[PDB]
Amino acid sequence: AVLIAAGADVNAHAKGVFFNPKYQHEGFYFGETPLALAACTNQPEIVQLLMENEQTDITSQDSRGNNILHALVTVAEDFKTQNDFVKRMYDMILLRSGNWELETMRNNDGLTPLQLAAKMGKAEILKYILSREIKEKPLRSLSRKFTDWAYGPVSSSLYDLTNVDTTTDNSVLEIIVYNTNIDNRHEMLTLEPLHTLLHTKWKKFAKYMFFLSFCFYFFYNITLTLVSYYRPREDEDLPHPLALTHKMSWLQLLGRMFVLIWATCISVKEGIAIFLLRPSDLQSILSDAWFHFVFFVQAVLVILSVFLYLFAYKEYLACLVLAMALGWANMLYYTRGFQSMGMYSVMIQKVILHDVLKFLFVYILFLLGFGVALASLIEKCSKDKKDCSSYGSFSDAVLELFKLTIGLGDLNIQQNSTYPILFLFLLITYVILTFVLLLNMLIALMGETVENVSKESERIWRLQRARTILEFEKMLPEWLRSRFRMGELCKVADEDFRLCLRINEVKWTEWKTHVSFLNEDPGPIR
Amino acid sequence: IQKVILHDVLKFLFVYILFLLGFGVALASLIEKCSKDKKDCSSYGSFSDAVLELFKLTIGLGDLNIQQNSTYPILFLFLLITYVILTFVLLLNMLIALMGETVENVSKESERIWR
Amino acid sequence: AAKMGKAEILKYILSREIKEKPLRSLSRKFTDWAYGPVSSSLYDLTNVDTTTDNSVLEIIVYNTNIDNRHEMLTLEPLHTLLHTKWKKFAKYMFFLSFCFYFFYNITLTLVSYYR
Amino acid sequence: LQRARTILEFEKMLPEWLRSRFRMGELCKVADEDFRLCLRINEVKWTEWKTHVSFLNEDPGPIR
Ligand SMILES: CCCCCCCC/C=C/CCCCCCCC(=O)O[C@@H](COC(=O)CCCCCCCCCCCCCCC)COP(=O)([O-])OCC[N+](C)(C)C
Ligand SMILES: CCCCCCCC/C=C/CCCCCCCC(=O)O[C@@H](COC(=O)CCCCCCCCCCCCCCC)COP(=O)([O-])OCC[N+](C)(C)C
Ligand SMILES: CCCCCCCC/C=C/CCCCCCCC(=O)O[C@@H](COC(=O)CCCCCCCCCCCCCCC)COP(=O)([O-])OCC[N+](C)(C)C
Ligand SMILES: CCCCCCCC/C=C/CCCCCCCC(=O)O[C@@H](COC(=O)CCCCCCCCCCCCCCC)COP(=O)([O-])OCC[N+](C)(C)C
Ligand SMILES: CCCCCCCC/C=C\CCCCCCCC(=O)O[C@@H](COC(=O)CCCCCCCCCCCCCCC)COP(=O)([O-])OCC[N+](C)(C)C
Ligand SMILES: CCCCCCCC/C=C\CCCCCCCC(=O)O[C@@H](COC(=O)CCCCCCCCCCCCCCC)COP(=O)([O-])OCC[N+](C)(C)C
Ligand SMILES: CCCCCCCC/C=C\CCCCCCCC(=O)O[C@@H](COC(=O)CCCCCCCCCCCCCCC)COP(=O)([O-])OCC[N+](C)(C)C
Ligand SMILES: CCCCCCCC/C=C\CCCCCCCC(=O)O[C@@H](COC(=O)CCCCCCCCCCCCCCC)COP(=O)([O-])OCC[N+](C)(C)C
Ligand SMILES: CCCCCCCC/C=C\CCCCCCCC(=O)O[C@@H](COC(=O)CCCCCCCCCCCCCCC)COP(=O)([O-])OCC[N+](C)(C)C
Ligand SMILES: CCCCCCCC/C=C\CCCCCCCC(=O)O[C@@H](COC(=O)CCCCCCCCCCCCCCC)COP(=O)([O-])OCC[N+](C)(C)C
Ligand SMILES: CCCCCCCC/C=C\CCCCCCCC(=O)O[C@@H](COC(=O)CCCCCCCCCCCCCCC)COP(=O)([O-])OCC[N+](C)(C)C
Ligand SMILES: CCCCCCCC/C=C\CCCCCCCC(=O)O[C@@H](COC(=O)CCCCCCCCCCCCCCC)COP(=O)([O-])OCC[N+](C)(C)C
Ligand code: NA
Ligand code: NA
Ligand code: NA
Structure with a gap:
């Protein structure tokens, strides 16, 4: 405090290699400003000393593009290893600023502090930000959770869905599901806005598209089995019924034609899904892209048995039998829709x-x-x-x-x-x-x-079903996405509409008089 | 059973x-x-x-x-x-x-289910 | 202490750091630098490494009398010292030992099967 | 423990000038005229907060 009054620069940056280390045992990244050093090393008295000084730039931004709120997300750890002081420094700095300018700022790779917590796997900071409810009257606009009404034990809340839903690009929901780097994805999908949002998508459209996917792939394995088992079994009866190379006006000949169409629809659609999502790590193939890989191999062998048939190599029959046995074993994919059989396939x-x-x-x-x-x-x-x-x-x-x-x-x-x-x-x-x-x-x-x-095994199953829901959502067209949209516009504050999601609760322990509701009349109005 | x-x-x-x-x-x-x-x-x-x-x-x-x-x-x-x-x-x-x-x-x- | 298996006295002596200024020369652990949380330490390796005879590392590994050898090799200078020997020379000599003994079993199998 | 017995038997058979090449540690001026051939281990601690006295080096980097 003596050096501050004598006129030291409170906005200096430490740009050396030690303050931007390549490895974790080389230096110490904290955010390069003396405000970020006092916040990251658990010194609350020097933080509130610096914020009172009018020369302090609280929205400054370093070489990585991080501000004070990005830097606290980077140094956060578990409760057991570190403490919960990072969660308390986040709250004290945010309430002192008083607006949304720190929360919407984007660093050089384009991430807000909310998207950076989900990218790195910081499950304790992310739990704080999503359920942030401020009871104070002038600073109530900084919340993301609002109490709509309350009467005795019963209450109704509203969760903000601004960047956590899949309407924009790089949502919180999209980053958590597709993050092969971290290893606690199945703990981060149990959080209270993200849990209800996947349950609502499954009831409205995802469970009906999952049943139509089952019926086509079942009929595809029936009509592949029957035309391979009931061949003409002679040397004089040489032509194969698939692709219909001889026109004998046979009824239901489209069953030989439905195989060729649906096999090309699979192998094209699975070639794209492998090409986009490319893991070099072996442990991401066996965990995420096993059934992407094995639906493609089964569909290639059906196509390859046709082009090898026209060259008359008499080795096509090896490729069909591998296509049947692998085809019926791929029906074990569709146990995801049920909880009891879905947790059983995680055991295998x-x-x-x-x-x-x-x-x-x-x-x-x-x-x-x-x-x-x-x-x-x-x-x-x-x-x-x-x-x-x-x-x-x-x-x-x-x-x-x-x-x-x-x-x-x-x-x-x-x-x-x-x-x-x-x-x-x-x-x-x-x-x-x-x-x-x-x-x-x-x-x-x-x-x-x-x-x-x-x-x-239950939380691993819900992660595998959550990947199914977000892929059905990307393929249906744009005017369907407007029809199956979750949430509702709510007048949160003075000229503030946020498209929130509603969750009801019952609490029998916490007794308190109710201030800071939105509605006085506690019913389901209309 | x-x-x-x-x-x-x-x-x-x-x-x-x-x-x-x-x-x-x-x-x-x-x-x-x-x-x-x-x-x-x-x-x-x-x-x-x-x-x-x-x-x-x-x-x-x-x-x-x-x-x-x-x-x-x-x-x-x-x-x-x-x-x-x-x-x-x-x-x-x-x-x-x-x-x-x-x-x-x-x-x-299993004892309380039997009773 | 290593000969008799006294795992609590041995943990004390290897990591002995004295903060006092005139008696700092009696330590075996020294803080090289520190900045915030991050720090770098130095452990003395005088009689614990295998350069002399009857090291602390040699006595613990070959001690058939005691029955807690596998708890005494988790100590903080002895754990890193075995990991450094495995990276520099021991893993490459272990692969050359595998290839000779594999070729020895191939050429013993083939000349006995094809008599 | 079983892998540690393998390491110390490979070390006894390689010759003397190889043991000088594959040697661990580094000479450190610990005190006044005291050199001890020490081994370096890094740590991170988030609970114990204290001002730092009794370091060896003032400049906290990996010098050279
Ligand atoms: C990333 C890794 C993923 C998997 C990699 C592959 C990708 C997907 C590829 C899929 C199949 C590609 C080959 C299709 C055509 C082969 C069929 C054929 O010709 O029959 C042949 C057998 O051939 C086999 O047995 C192969 C069966 C699949 C083995 C694939 C490795 C699995 C590893 C498990 C362990 C290794 C098992 C080793 C195999 C025992 C021989 O035929 P024949 O009976 O001798 O007939 C005599 C010929 N005559 C009658 C004309 C005179
Ligand atoms: C505990 C119990 C389980 C143990 C299991 C292990 C048991 C191991 C197996 C043991 C027995 C197999 C060998 C017996 C030899 C048979 C005789 C023969 O014909 O030999 C032939 C070779 O033999 C082969 O090619 C074998 C083909 C299968 C390869 C291994 C299966 C891969 C399974 C992967 C699946 C992964 C499953 C997915 C998992 C998630 C050659 O015979 P020949 O003398 O040269 O004659 C000329 C050939 N001719 C006649 C055509 C001209
Ligand atoms: C791990 C081991 C255990 C696995 C178990 C599962 C194994 C699955 C079974 C596997 C083998 C069974 C099929 C073999 C075919 C035999 C040949 C045959 O005659 O086929 C016949 C059909 O076949 C049938 O009708 C089968 C009748 C039993 C149905 C299933 C049993 C229900 C058990 C429920 C009990 C619940 C117990 C209570 C639980 C609390 C027809 O043959 P065909 O060619 O048309 O010939 C003309 C007929 N003719 C000759 C009269 C004119
Ligand atoms: C500290 C303890 C460590 C181990 C101790 C040993 C140290 C290592 C030693 C190793 C082997 C030393 C013997 C080598 C030569 C013997 C081979 C031979 O002659 O065949 C003989 C069998 O002989 C056997 O079956 C012996 C097989 C090994 C048994 C060793 C004890 C294991 C204990 C397990 C339980 C006890 C098992 C008892 C055995 C069933 C008989 O041959 P034949 O078929 O009758 O042919 C007729 C002859 N004619 C054709 C010329 C007319
Ligand atoms: C209201 C709720 C529904 C609203 C939206 C529904 C419309 C949909 C609009 C567009 C969907 C476009 C589909 C893309 C085609 C590609 C083919 C393909 O790969 O299989 C796709 C077919 O699975 C489905 O997507 C089922 C829905 C298609 C139905 C098409 C019209 C129905 C006509 C029939 C009318 C019957 C009437 C009966 C009832 C009266 C998906 O494949 P997959 O299984 O996901 O991939 C395998 C799994 N893997 C990930 C491991 C690899
Ligand atoms: C505890 C258990 C309780 C329940 C009991 C369970 C049932 C027990 C299980 C089995 C019992 C029955 C076995 C034999 C059947 C009798 C013969 C038959 O009808 O086949 C006929 C049609 O067959 C075909 O056309 C080919 C098969 C088509 C479908 C492919 C099945 C794979 C389904 C996999 C996924 C589905 C499973 C998903 C999970 C459930 C051919 O008959 P054939 O051989 O040519 O006969 C020649 C003799 N003859 C000339 C005199 C006529
Ligand atoms: C079906 C047959 C065809 C497949 C064969 C292809 C080979 C490779 C196939 C699949 C890759 C296997 C590794 C997967 C990736 C690592 C993840 C893992 O779970 O590892 C586990 C298994 O790892 C082992 O220890 C296996 C040891 C034997 C491997 C070879 C057996 C081949 C079977 C036939 C033999 C003849 C073939 C000759 C082989 C020379 C480690 O087990 P864990 O102790 O619980 O560790 C926890 C997980 N962790 C590592 C992440 C910490
Ligand atoms: C390319 C062919 C492979 C089979 C060949 C054997 C050797 C291959 C080498 C190694 C063997 C494979 C190692 C096991 C890896 C995990 C298995 C698994 O996913 O468990 C599943 C159980 O359902 C099954 O898939 C069990 C059946 C295994 C294959 C059986 C062969 C079918 C016969 C065909 C014979 C002809 C084959 C013709 C072609 C050669 C469910 O597990 P999950 O929790 O859902 O995890 C997936 C994660 N995901 C859902 C997000 C994606
Ligand atoms: C059945 C087995 C027999 C043998 C099979 C042999 C092989 C077996 C292989 C693997 C074993 C697994 C078998 C898969 C069975 C179905 C797949 C599935 O998971 O369904 C799932 C969805 O399905 C439904 O919603 C139920 C059907 C309602 C009507 C749907 C018609 C769609 C058309 C109307 C729209 C027009 C669109 C058309 C125009 C665009 C079941 O989901 P659930 O859990 O019941 O949902 C409740 C969830 N909750 C509890 C959380 C609230
Ligand atoms: C003993 C007296 C005589 C037998 C009865 C007489 C015959 C009865 C006939 C039909 C009854 C068939 C079963 C229906 C009831 C199952 C209830 C269940 O828990 O299953 C579960 C999954 O189980 C599956 O559904 C996996 C797929 C198996 C095929 C059955 C599909 C049902 C469609 C019927 C097609 C008919 C074909 C059937 C051919 C035989 C339901 O999924 P879940 O609830 O989301 O998960 C449970 C966990 N939870 C509760 C906490 C959420
Ligand atoms: C003996 C053979 C004849 C019977 C067959 C008649 C079918 C239906 C018969 C009886 C009804 C079964 C459900 C009972 C009511 C629910 C209670 C329960 O315990 O569910 C349990 C089993 O539920 C399953 O998941 C079974 C999955 C396979 C069902 C079909 C197998 C048919 C066997 C032959 C295959 C060929 C037939 C083709 C099938 C398409 C759920 O297990 P859980 O994880 O511990 O959950 C805890 C309980 N809970 C749900 C209450 C929370
Ligand atoms: C799930 C599984 C996935 C993977 C599948 C795994 C594979 C499945 C396992 C086995 C399947 C194959 C079995 C039969 C092979 C065919 C015959 C052959 O080639 O042998 C030939 C050469 O054989 C020799 O020269 C002697 C053996 C030399 C090597 C010793 C092997 C021990 C390796 C142990 C350590 C390694 C294991 C380490 C751990 C992995 C001799 O052939 P023949 O008998 O004289 O034939 C006579 C007929 N003919 C005259 C017509 C020609
Ligand atoms: Na038998
Ligand atoms: Na058991
Ligand atoms: Na038996």
């Missing part, structure tokens, strides 16, 4: 990654290891000239040890072995390692995985 | 029949006409026969013969091992793990 994804792939690595090491050792111990079968042993090859001994595991066939030890006791020692050692050890430890490890992901 | 059938067995039987009828058509349409040996060349000749052979494969009865009348014998073996991994390794072992989750919850309440 976590069990294959964590348990089955570790099992199959160690199993093939034992199968191919004991398979060579048994196969090189059998003599030549020219003494009986046929049928002396079933372990004569490497291909035969691997097949016999695989049937031994799943329990098929019969066990014969009267082989053509050079050493018959050594053949039995290696075979019982195989049964102990696989039947007793590995297959029973697989059950014990799956019970460890199920116990952990049962806490999270 | 009442809580296990509702929560575990019916979800298992829905996904199992999708895989059984799905791989059953794919294997059955890959077998040729059996008029070269005139009898007994393949046991996957029909849709009714291939569904029966994949059901005996799950409960462990019979014998596994791969010398079929297939047009493509390596493709027939790839689809058959893919069926064993999905049902014998994945679905039947995850059924045991999910029942242990149900038993742990309803053991707190």
Whole structure:
């Protein structure tokens, strides 16, 4: 305070490399101004000392384009690691300014402080901003939550939907759903305006478009199965019924034509969806774009079986059978619409990654290891000239040890072995390692995985259904988006209309007299 | 028994029949006409026969013969091992793990439901 | 302390930082710089690294008598010192050990199978 | 612990001039005529607020 009165510049910028570090262990980014340093290092007395000085530029902006409110979002962390002082510095600076100028300012990559919290995954600052209700009378215009009426326990609130709904570009809802970088997307969609807004989209249009998507893809797999199972099975009856290369005036020939149309509609539409969303990270393919990738492969093999048919290579029938078996396995995508079967498909994804792939690595090491050792111990079968042993090859001994595991066939030890006791020692050692050890430890490890992901399988399901809703919304035309629009215009303040969303509550603990309602008459008027 | 059938067995039987009828058509349409040996060349000749052979494969009865009348014998073996991994390794072992989750919850309440 | 397995005395001695000015030479941890939250420390490596004989690192790894070796290697100078050895030379020698022993099992399998 | 036993056996077999090349640490003037070959670890703490006395360097950057 002595240096301030003596005339030090309160608007200096620290532009060095230490104050803009490349890595987190190199320096300390705080916002480059002495106002941002006092705010980010938990010194509230120097902050309110600086804001009283009339030379203080509170809307200044650094080299990144950040202001004081962008800088507090960047340094925010959890409750456990840091504290909740960043949430209190955000509130104290905002109420001192008194207008919307800090909240609508955009940095160099074009983000407001509200969009920057959702981009980086700051779940505690984002919870504050969306439900911000100010009871004070002159500063009530800075709120985003308004109490419409109240009577006893019952109350009705209004949430502002300005940049959180998908009417503009880069909404809060769009950034959270499509953010492959952060790893807490499924915790940020439980917030109280974002939870109701997805439930309203599912009731009005998304559940009916999800049922029409199911019926077309079911009929596509029926008419692909029937024209492949009921072929003309002769060499004289050579032409294939698909694409209708011979006109015999057959009724319902469009079923051979509906396959070719709908296969090109898929492979074009799935080639675009892969081309736009390109992850280089492997963990984003298996988490977000598995069914985008596997609907495209199934649709290419149907198209490829036609162009390979006209060249008469007689290898088209390999491509159709792969197209049927992959086609009926893709019907497990449509379990998203139900909660009970949708949480069950999240279990299958976590069990294959964590348990089955570790099992199959160690199993093939034992199968191919004991398979060579048994196969090189059998003599030549020219003494009986046929049928002396079933372990004569490497291909035969691997097949016999695989049937031994799943329990098929019969066990014969009267082989053509050079050493018959050594053949039995290696075979019982195989049964102990696989039947007793590995297959029973697989059950014990799956019970460890199920116990952990049962806490999270509901929130992972709601993230997967939320991605379906926002893709149905992008394809329907513009005049449908005006018809299925959520919210209602509300006279919030003097000449302020904000298109808000209404949510009702009941509270039995907090008793208080009601001031700062909007309406006196507490009913549902009209 | 009442809580296990509702929560575990019916979800298992829905996904199992999708895989059984799905791989059953794919294997059955890959077998040729059996008029070269005139009898007994393949046991996957029909849709009714291939569904029966994949059901005996799950409960462990019979014998596994791969010398079929297939047009493509390596493709027939790839689809058959893919069926064993999905049902014998994945679905039947995850059924045991999910029942242990149900038993742990309803053991707190099974006495009061009985009364 | 490392020979007998005294994990609480050993944690004290390795991270010993004395803020007092005349007795600051008795420390084994020094603050190099600091600015706000961020800071940089220096840990002494006199008898804990494997340059001499009977280091603290060598005694803890090879001590068959005690039964808490895996808790004593999480200490803050001993944890980083093993991570630095793995990045510079140990991971490349571990890959060369794998390739020789893999080729040794291939050429033992092939000359025994194809007699 | 099992990977740590692998690291110390690879270190005993490589020759002496390799051990000088792959050496950890750096000489630091700790006090008056005291050099100790120390190891550097960075931290971030958001709870403990205090003014900083008893640093070694005034300039808080990665010098060179
Ligand atoms: C615990 C139980 C489960 C274990 C599972 C692992 C078991 C491993 C399998 C064990 C048995 C398989 C080998 C037996 C050999 C058969 C004989 C044969 O014909 O050999 C042939 C080669 O063999 C192949 O080409 C195999 C083809 C399948 C490859 C592996 C399946 C991939 C599954 C992935 C699916 C992912 C599922 C999705 C997961 C989410 C060659 O025979 P040949 O002598 O050269 O004769 C000439 C050929 N001719 C006759 C045409 C002219
Ligand atoms: C600290 C302890 C560590 C391990 C200790 C060992 C150290 C490492 C040693 C390793 C092997 C040393 C023996 C090498 C030569 C033997 C091979 C041989 O001659 O075949 C013989 C079998 O012999 C076997 O089956 C032995 C197989 C290993 C058993 C080792 C004990 C494992 C304990 C597990 C449980 C006990 C299992 C008992 C065994 C079933 C018999 O041959 P044949 O088929 O009858 O042929 C007829 C002969 N004719 C054709 C010429 C007419
Ligand atoms: C994990 C293991 C378990 C999996 C279970 C699921 C396995 C699924 C089953 C798999 C195998 C069944 C199909 C094999 C076909 C046999 C051949 C056949 O005859 O086909 C026949 C049809 O087939 C039928 O009609 C089947 C009848 C049973 C229906 C399903 C059982 C309901 C169980 C509910 C009980 C609830 C229990 C209560 C629960 C609390 C027709 O054959 P065809 O060619 O037309 O020949 C002409 C007929 N003729 C000869 C008379 C003239
Ligand atoms: C990012 C990664 C995603 C997946 C990558 C692929 C992308 C999607 C691609 C999809 C299919 C592309 C190939 C289509 C045509 C092949 C069919 C064919 O010709 O039959 C062949 C088999 O060929 C197979 O078995 C391939 C089956 C799919 C294996 C794909 C790898 C899965 C990995 C799982 C583990 C590896 C399994 C290895 C395979 C066992 C052989 O035919 P045949 O029976 O010998 O007949 C004799 C020929 N004759 C009759 C004319 C004389
Ligand atoms: C009021 C509520 C509805 C209002 C709006 C409805 C109009 C819609 C307006 C425009 C939609 C344009 C569709 C684009 C075509 C591309 C084809 C395609 O890829 O499949 C698309 C077809 O799924 C649907 O979109 C269903 C809606 C189409 C219905 C068209 C008219 C109905 C005619 C019939 C009248 C029957 C009458 C019966 C009732 C009387 C979507 O594919 P997907 O499944 O999303 O992708 C696969 C999943 N994946 C993400 C993993 C890859
Ligand atoms: C390209 C072919 C692949 C199959 C080949 C096997 C080798 C491939 C290599 C590795 C195997 C795959 C690793 C598993 C990865 C996750 C699986 C999964 O998504 O779980 C799903 C369970 O529903 C299923 O998809 C289970 C069936 C697996 C494929 C079965 C093969 C079908 C037979 C065809 C035979 C011929 C094949 C012809 C072509 C070769 C549901 O999980 P989720 O929670 O919904 O997560 C998805 C996230 N998302 C919804 C937002 C997107
Ligand atoms: C059925 C199985 C049999 C065997 C199948 C074999 C393979 C099985 C494979 C996978 C298993 C999964 C099977 C998928 C079943 C349907 C898909 C689905 O999820 O539906 C969903 C939506 O569907 C509905 O809304 C219900 C139908 C109402 C009428 C819709 C007609 C649309 C036309 C009218 C418009 C004109 C448009 C035309 C002109 C443009 C169900 O959603 P829900 O949960 O019930 O909704 C309640 C949600 N709530 C609880 C949150 C409030
Ligand atoms: C035992 C006495 C004799 C048997 C009865 C006699 C036969 C009865 C005939 C038909 C009854 C079929 C089931 C309907 C009731 C299910 C209730 C349920 O919880 O399912 C759930 C999902 O379950 C699914 O729906 C997934 C798809 C399975 C196919 C059934 C679709 C129903 C359409 C019928 C087509 C007919 C074809 C059927 C062919 C057999 C409902 O979804 P959810 O509610 O959103 O999620 C639950 C979680 N929550 C409650 C908290 C939200
Ligand atoms: C179906 C068969 C065809 C597929 C085969 C293609 C291979 C690659 C296919 C899919 C990619 C697998 C990794 C996915 C991405 C990482 C995420 C993950 O969940 O990793 C998990 C599995 O990771 C493992 O440890 C697997 C070890 C064996 C891999 C090879 C088995 C091949 C099966 C046939 C063998 C013969 C083939 C020869 C192989 C040389 C790590 O498990 P976790 O401990 O729970 O860690 C938590 C997750 N974390 C890492 C994010 C922290
Ligand atoms: C879900 C799964 C996804 C991935 C699928 C995984 C693959 C599935 C697994 C297996 C499928 C393939 C089995 C049969 C192979 C065909 C025959 C062949 O090529 O062998 C030939 C060469 O064989 C040799 O020379 C001896 C073996 C040398 C290497 C030793 C292997 C041990 C590796 C262990 C460590 C590695 C494992 C580490 C962990 C991964 C000999 O052929 P033959 O028997 O003499 O045939 C005679 C008939 N003929 C005369 C007509 C020609
Ligand atoms: C034995 C075979 C004959 C019966 C078949 C008749 C069908 C209908 C029969 C009985 C009615 C089933 C629902 C009961 C009423 C709801 C209560 C409940 O416990 O739901 C549970 C099961 O709900 C499911 O999710 C089942 C999904 C598959 C249903 C169809 C399987 C048919 C089996 C053969 C396949 C071929 C048939 C083709 C089917 C298209 C929900 O599980 P949860 O997650 O623990 O939820 C907690 C409970 N809650 C919902 C109250 C919150
Ligand atoms: C606990 C359980 C309770 C419920 C019970 C459940 C039922 C039990 C399951 C199965 C029992 C029935 C099995 C055999 C059927 C009898 C034969 C038949 O009708 O097929 C005929 C038509 O077949 C075709 O046209 C090809 C198949 C078309 C549809 C593809 C099915 C895949 C659906 C997957 C998704 C749906 C599943 C989604 C999830 C549910 C052909 O018959 P054939 O072989 O040529 O016969 C020749 C002999 N003959 C000449 C004398 C005539
Ligand atoms: Na059996
Ligand atoms: Na049997
Ligand atoms: Na268990």
